């Protein structure tokens, strides 16, 4: 949908996991929708959540993911 | 796989600690 766009992740979910946990990562930088930075994720066992790009556990899991 | 960039040093290993995951909270649309 491209009429009214809000953040790809309006909030974040503060649950530290490991790259083996997370099978999809998508990094959304401040858009014309939301002037913030948002990490979208899918954990294979672990659902598809929103992540805090500022949180160090993520920094690893995403870094080591990519 | 990746590629591109230049300069660096240090880094690598996966995980972290404290906390955990699954559970609930998160959302968007």
Swiss-Prot record, chain A:
The gene is CXCL8. It comes from the Eukaryota. Disulfide bonds join 7-34, 9-50. The record marks 1-2 as: Cleavage. This is IL-8(6-77).
Curated annotation (Swiss-Prot), chain B:
Residues 1-29 are extracellular. It is found in: Cell membrane. It comes from the Eukaryota. Glycans are attached at residues 3, 16. Belongs to the G-protein coupled receptor 1 family. Interacts with IL8. Interacts with GNAI2. Receptor to interleukin-8, which is a powerful neutrophils chemotactic factor. Binding of IL-8 to the receptor causes activation of neutrophils. This response is mediated via a G-protein that activates a phosphatidylinositol-calcium second messenger system. This is C-X-C chemokine receptor type 1. The gene is CXCR1. The chain holds residues 1 to 29 of 350 of the full protein.
